[PDB]
Amino acid sequence: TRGRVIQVMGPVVDVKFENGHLPAIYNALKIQHKARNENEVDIDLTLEVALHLGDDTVRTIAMASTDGLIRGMEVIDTGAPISVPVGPETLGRMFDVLGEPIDEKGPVKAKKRWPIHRPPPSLSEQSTEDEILETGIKVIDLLAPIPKGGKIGLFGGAGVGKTVLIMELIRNIAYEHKGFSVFAGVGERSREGNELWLEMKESGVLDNTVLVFGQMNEPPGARFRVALTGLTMAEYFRDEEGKDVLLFIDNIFRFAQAGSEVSALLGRMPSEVGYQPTLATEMAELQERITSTRRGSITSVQAIYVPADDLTDPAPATTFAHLDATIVLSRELAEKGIYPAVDPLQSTSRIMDPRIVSEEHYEVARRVREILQRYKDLQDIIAILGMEELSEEDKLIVQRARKIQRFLSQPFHVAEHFTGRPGKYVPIEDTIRGFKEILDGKLDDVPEQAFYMVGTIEEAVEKAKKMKK
Amino acid sequence: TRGRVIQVMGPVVDVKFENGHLPAIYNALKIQHKARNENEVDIDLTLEVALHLGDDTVRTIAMASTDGLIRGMEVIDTGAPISVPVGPETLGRMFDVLGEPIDEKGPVKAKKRWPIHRPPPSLSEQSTEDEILETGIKVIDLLAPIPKGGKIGLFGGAGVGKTVLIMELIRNIAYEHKGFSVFAGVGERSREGNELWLEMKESGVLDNTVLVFGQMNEPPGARFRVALTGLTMAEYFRDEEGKDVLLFIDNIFRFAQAGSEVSALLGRMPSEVGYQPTLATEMAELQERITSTRRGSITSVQAIYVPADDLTDPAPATTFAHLDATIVLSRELAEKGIYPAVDPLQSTSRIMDPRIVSEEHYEVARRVREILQRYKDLQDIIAILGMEELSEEDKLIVQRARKIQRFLSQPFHVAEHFTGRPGKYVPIEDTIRGFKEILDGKLDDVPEQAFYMVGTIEEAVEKAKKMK
Amino acid sequence: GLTMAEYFRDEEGKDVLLFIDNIFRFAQAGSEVSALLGRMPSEVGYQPTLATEMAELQERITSTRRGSITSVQAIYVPADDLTDPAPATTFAHLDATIVLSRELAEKGIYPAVDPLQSTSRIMDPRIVSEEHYEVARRVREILQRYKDLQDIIAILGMEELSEEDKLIVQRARKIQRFLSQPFHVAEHFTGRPGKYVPIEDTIRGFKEILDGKLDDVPEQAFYMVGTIEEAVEKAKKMK
Amino acid sequence: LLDAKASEHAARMTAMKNATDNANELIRTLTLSYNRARQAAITQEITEIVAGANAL
Amino acid sequence: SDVGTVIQVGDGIARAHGLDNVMSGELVEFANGVMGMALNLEENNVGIVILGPYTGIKEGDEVRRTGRIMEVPVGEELIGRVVNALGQPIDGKGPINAKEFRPVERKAPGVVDRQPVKEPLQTGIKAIDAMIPIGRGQRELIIGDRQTGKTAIAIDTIINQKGQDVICIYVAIGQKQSTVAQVVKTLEEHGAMEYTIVVAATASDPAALQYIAPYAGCAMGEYFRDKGKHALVVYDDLSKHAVAYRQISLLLRRPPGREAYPGDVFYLHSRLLERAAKLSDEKGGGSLTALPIIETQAGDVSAYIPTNVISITDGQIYLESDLFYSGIRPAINVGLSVSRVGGAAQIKAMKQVAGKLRLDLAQYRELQAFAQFASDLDEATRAQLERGQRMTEILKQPQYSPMPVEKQVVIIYAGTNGYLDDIPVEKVKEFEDGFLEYIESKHPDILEEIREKKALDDELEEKLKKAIKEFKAT
Amino acid sequence: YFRDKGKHALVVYDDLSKHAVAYRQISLLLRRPPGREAYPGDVFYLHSRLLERAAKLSDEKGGGSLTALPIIETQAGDVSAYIPTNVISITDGQIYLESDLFYSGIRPAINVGLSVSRVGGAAQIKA
Amino acid sequence: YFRDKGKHALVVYDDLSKHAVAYRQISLLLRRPPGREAYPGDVFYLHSRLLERAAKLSDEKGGGSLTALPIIETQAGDVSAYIPTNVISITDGQIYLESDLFYSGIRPAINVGLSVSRVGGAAQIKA
Ligand SMILES: Nc1ncnc2c1ncn2[C@@H]1O[C@H](COP(=O)(O)OP(=O)(O)O)[C@@H](O)[C@H]1O
Ligand SMILES: [Mg+2]
Q: Are B191 and E280 in contact (CB under 8 A)?
A: no
F32 touches chain C (CB under 8 A): no
Q: Are F108 and F65 in contact (CB under 8 A)?
A: no
* Distance, CA of A272 to CA of F21 (rounded, Å): 23
**How many residues are present in chain A?**
469
Establish whether chain A is in contact with chain F, requiring a minimum of 3 CB pairs below 8 angstroms.
Answer: yes
Backbone angles phi, psi at C148, to 5 degrees: -75, -10
* Distance, CA of B405 to CA of B409 (rounded, Å): 8
Alpha-carbon Rg for chain A, nearest whole angstrom, is 26
| Strand A181-184 versus strand A83-86 pairing type | unpaired
* Distance, CA of E208 to CA of E352 (rounded, Å): 49
| Strand B209-215 versus strand B93-95 pairing type | parallel
CA trace torsion E29, E30, E32, E36 (10° rounding)? -70
* Distance, CA of E450 to CA of E464 (rounded, Å): 17
Q: How far is A390 from chain F (nearest CA, A)?
A: 31
- Provide the terminal-to-terminal Cα distance of chain G, rounded to the nearest Å: 33
What DSSP designation does E113 have?
S
Ligand 1 nearest-atom number relative to CA A339 = 1
Interface contacts A/D by beta carbons within 8 Å: 6
The HSE-up count of residue C50 (CA atoms within 13 Å, CB side) is 28
User: Whose alpha carbon is nearest atom 24 of ligand 1?
Assistant: F118
F32 touches chain D (CB under 8 A): no
Vertex F108 angle, CA F107 and F114, to 5°: 115
G chain contacts of residue B277, beta-carbon cutoff 8 Å: 24-25, 28-29, 38
Candidate of F116, F118, F119 to mutate for ligand 1, largest count of ligand atoms within 8 Å of Cβ? F118
Amino acid A71 reads: R
Picking from B5, B56, B67, the residue whose alpha carbon sits closest to that of residue B30 is B5
B318 touches chain G (CB under 8 A): no
Q: C74 CB contacts (<8 Å, ≥6 apart)?
A: C20, C21, C22, C23
Backbone angles phi, psi at F50, to 5 degrees: -85, -65
Q: Are E233 and E276 in contact (CB under 8 A)?
A: yes
Q: D14 CB contacts (<8 Å, ≥6 apart)?
A: none
Ligand 1 nearest-atom number relative to CA F121 = 27
Residue A18 CA, ligand 2 centroid: distance in Å:
48
Query: Which one is catalytic: A48, A134, A168, A188?
Result: A188
Q: Are B216 and B254 in contact (CB under 8 A)?
A: yes
Q: A313 CB contacts (<8 Å, ≥6 apart)?
A: A273, A306, A307
G120 touches chain C (CB under 8 A): yes
Backbone angles phi, psi at B302, to 5 degrees: -125, 130
Our answer on whether the CB atom of A191 is closer than 6 Å to any ligand 1 atom is: no
Picking from A239, A142, A141, A234, the residue whose alpha carbon sits closest to that of residue A181 is A234
Cα B211 to chain centroid distance, Å, stands at 12
Q: Are B53 and B83 in contact (CB under 8 A)?
A: no
* Distance, CA of A350 to CA of E146 (rounded, Å): 11
Q: How far is D28 from chain E (nearest CA, A)?
A: 16
* 8 Å CB contact of G41 and C78: no
Residue A16 CA, ligand 1 centroid: distance in Å:
49
* DSSP-based three-state secondary structure for E6: strand
Establish whether chain C is in contact with chain F, requiring a minimum of 3 CB pairs below 8 angstroms.
Answer: yes
* DSSP-based three-state secondary structure for B186: strand
The HSE-up count of residue A275 (CA atoms within 13 Å, CB side) is 25
Nearest CA in chain D to F35: D49
Which pairs count as long-range contacts for E59-62, CB under 8 Å and 24+ apart, including other chains?
A: E59/A22, E59/A52, E59/A54, E59/A56, E59/E6, E59/E7, E59/E8, E59/E9, E60/A21, E60/A22, E60/E5, E60/E6, E61/E5, E61/E6, E61/E30, E61/E31, E61/E32, E62/E3, E62/E4, E62/E5, E62/E6, E62/E30, E62/E31
| Strand C119-120 versus strand E3-9 pairing type | unpaired
* Distance, CA of C213 to CA of C221 (rounded, Å): 15
Alpha-carbon Rg for chain B, nearest whole angstrom, is 26
* Distance, CA of B235 to CA of B86 (rounded, Å): 9
Q: Are A117 and A90 in contact (CB under 8 A)?
A: no
Q: How far is F26 from chain A (nearest CA, A)?
A: 13
Ligand 1 nearest-atom number relative to CA A162 = 22
Q: Are B277 and B270 in contact (CB under 8 A)?
A: yes
* Distance, CA of B231 to CA of B320 (rounded, Å): 20
Helices (H), A240-313: 252-266, 279-287
* Distance, CA of B423 to CA of B410 (rounded, Å): 8
Peptide linkage before G108 cis (omega within 30 of 0): yes
Cα B345 to chain centroid distance, Å, stands at 22
Active-site amino acid positions of E: 340
Q: Are A314 and A273 in contact (CB under 8 A)?
A: yes
* Distance, CA of A145 to CA of E381 (rounded, Å): 43
* Distance, CA of B302 to CA of C199 (rounded, Å): 67
Picking from E198, E4, E172, E227, the residue whose alpha carbon sits closest to that of residue E83 is E198
* Distance, CA of B261 to CA of B283 (rounded, Å): 15
Picking from E83, E91, E122, E84, the residue whose alpha carbon sits closest to that of residue E185 is E91
Helices (H), E58-169: 128-131, 150-160
* DSSP-based three-state secondary structure for E120: strand
SS3 readout for chain F: CCHHHCCEEEEEECCHHHHHHHHHHHHHHCCCCECHHHCECCHHHHHHHHHCCCCECCCCCCCCEEEEEECCCCCCCCCCCHHHHHHHHHCCEECCECHHHHHCCCCCCECCCCCEECCCCCCCCCC
Q: A363 CB contacts (<8 Å, ≥6 apart)?
A: none
CA trace torsion E458, E463, E468, E469 (10° rounding)? 110
> Beta-carbon neighbour count of residue B44 at 10 Å?
10
* Distance, CA of E238 to CA of E246 (rounded, Å): 12
* DSSP-based three-state secondary structure for A67: coil
* Distance, CA of E284 to CA of A32 (rounded, Å): 73
Q: F122 CB contacts (<8 Å, ≥6 apart)?
A: none
* Distance, CA of B192 to CA of E111 (rounded, Å): 9
* Distance, CA of B162 to CA of B150 (rounded, Å): 19
Q: C15 CB contacts (<8 Å, ≥6 apart)?
A: C67, C68, C70
Backbone angles phi, psi at E101, to 5 degrees: -130, 130
Q: Are E336 and E131 in contact (CB under 8 A)?
A: no
* Distance, CA of A212 to CA of E53 (rounded, Å): 28
In this complex, which of E69, E271, E307 lies closest to B68 when CB atoms are compared?
A: E69
* Distance, CA of C140 to CA of C124 (rounded, Å): 15
Picking from B297, B169, B322, the residue whose alpha carbon sits closest to that of residue B234 is B297
Amino acid A136 reads: G
Alpha-carbon Rg for chain G, nearest whole angstrom, is 17
Picking from A411, A392, G81, the residue whose alpha carbon sits closest to that of residue B272 is G81
* Distance, CA of A372 to CA of E144 (rounded, Å): 25
Q: A145 CB contacts (<8 Å, ≥6 apart)?
A: A132, A325, A349, A351, A352, A357, A361
Q: Are C119 and C112 in contact (CB under 8 A)?
A: no
User: Kind and range of the H or E element at A248?
Assistant: strand A244-250
The HSE-up count of residue B130 (CA atoms within 13 Å, CB side) is 15
CA trace torsion A68, A72, A78, A83 (10° rounding)? 20
Question: Got the DSSP string for G54-91?
Answer: --B--TTTTS-EEEEEE----STT-TTSHHHHHHHTTS
Picking from E433, E443, E467, E405, the residue whose alpha carbon sits closest to that of residue E164 is E405
Query: Which one is catalytic: B93, B151, B162, B171?
Result: B162
The C residues from 56 to 95 touching G (CB cutoff 8 Å) are 76, 78-80
* 8 Å CB contact of G36 and C108: no
* Distance, CA of B220 to CA of B214 (rounded, Å): 10
Q: How far is D56 from chain F (nearest CA, A)?
A: 8
Alpha-carbon Rg for chain E, nearest whole angstrom, is 25
Q: Are A315 and A275 in contact (CB under 8 A)?
A: yes
Q: C184 CB contacts (<8 Å, ≥6 apart)?
A: C194, C196
* DSSP-based three-state secondary structure for B363: helix
* DSSP-based three-state secondary structure for G29: helix
**How many residues are present in chain B?**
468
Picking from A288, A266, A289, A287, the residue whose alpha carbon sits closest to that of residue A276 is A266
E365 touches chain B (CB under 8 A): no
Backbone angles phi, psi at E315, to 5 degrees: 160, 165
Which pairs count as long-range contacts for A14-18, CB under 8 Å and 24+ apart, including other chains?
A: A14/A53, A14/A57, A14/A58, A14/A59, A14/A60, A15/A47, A15/A57, A15/A58, A15/A60, A15/A75, A16/A55, A16/A56, A16/A57, A16/A58, A17/A56, A17/A57, A17/A58, A17/A77, A18/A56
Diameter of chain E by CA atoms?
87
Our answer on whether the CB atom of A415 is closer than 6 Å to any ligand 1 atom is: yes
Identify whether A416 is a catalytic site residue.
Answer: no
Burial-class residue A286 by CB neighbours within 10 Å (0-12, 13-18, 19+).
buried
- Elucidated via: cryo-EM
* Distance, CA of A333 to CA of G115 (rounded, Å): 53
Query: Which one is catalytic: F32, F36, F53, F118?
Result: F118
Residue A54 CA, ligand 2 centroid: distance in Å:
44
D chain contacts of residue B269, beta-carbon cutoff 8 Å: 50, 54
In this complex, which of A51, A285, A366 lies closest to E10 when CB atoms are compared?
A: A51
C194 touches chain G (CB under 8 A): no
Identify the sign of the CA torsion E108, E111, E114, E116: positive
* Distance, CA of E128 to CA of E395 (rounded, Å): 9
- Provide the terminal-to-terminal Cα distance of chain C, rounded to the nearest Å: 54
Nearest CA in chain E to D42: E259
Identify the sign of the CA torsion E61, E67, E72, E74: negative
**How many residues are present in chain G?**
127
* Distance, CA of G76 to CA of B337 (rounded, Å): 32
* Distance, CA of A231 to CA of B207 (rounded, Å): 72
- Provide the terminal-to-terminal Cα distance of chain E, rounded to the nearest Å: 82
D47 touches chain B (CB under 8 A): yes
The HSE-up count of residue A141 (CA atoms within 13 Å, CB side) is 21
Backbone angles phi, psi at F112, to 5 degrees: -65, -25
Q: What is the resolution of this structure in A?
A: 2.5
Peptide linkage before A340 cis (omega within 30 of 0): yes
Neighbours of chain D (3+ CB pairs under 8 A): A, B, C, E, F, G
Q: Are A17 and A49 in contact (CB under 8 A)?
A: no
Residue F96 CA, ligand 1 centroid: distance in Å:
19
* Distance, CA of B92 to CA of F69 (rounded, Å): 81
F chain contacts of residue D44, beta-carbon cutoff 8 Å: none
Our answer on whether the CB atom of A161 is closer than 6 Å to any ligand 1 atom is: yes
Q: C199 CB contacts (<8 Å, ≥6 apart)?
A: C132
CA distances from B435 to B138, B341, B406 (A): 10, 19, 11
* Distance, CA of B228 to CA of B99 (rounded, Å): 11
Q: How far is B230 from chain G (nearest CA, A)?
A: 28
Cα A212 to chain centroid distance, Å, stands at 12
* 8 Å CB contact of D49 and A267: no
Rounded-to-5 percentages of helix, strand, coil across chain D: 95, 0, 5
